[PDB]
């Protein structure tokens, strides 16, 4: 895995929540594929 320091008007918590949402949807899609 790679981590890239960045900057945004969000905070770490909201970014982690968005990552959780996106990864959950992506895993659901990959599971539904098979």
């Amino acid at each position: 895995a790679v981590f890239d320091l960045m900057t945004s008007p969000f905070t770490q918590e909201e970014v982690l929540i968005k990552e959780i949402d996106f990864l959950k949807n992506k895993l659901l899609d990959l599971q539904s594929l098979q």
């Binding site: 981590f3 320091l5 990864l23 959950k24 098979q34």
Partner: protein, 53 residues
């Protein structure tokens, strides 16, 4: 700064050693990575997930 910004350690991007250009090996390693990262982030945050297999 009219728009206050923060230092945000960004999200982990999936990086495979050998990129095989087809979807089979990619999807296998990617499902593994997704489950691992979901577990890591659930350990970091005070929350729970649904559908993790």
């Amino acid at each position: 700064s009219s728009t206050p910004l923060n230092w945000v350690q960004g999200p982990a991007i999936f990086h495979m050693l050998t990129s095989p250009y087809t979807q089979d090996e990619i999807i296998n390693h990617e499902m593994n990575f997704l489950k691992g990262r979901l577990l890591e982030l659930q350990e970091i945050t005070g929350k729970k997930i649904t559908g993790v297999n």
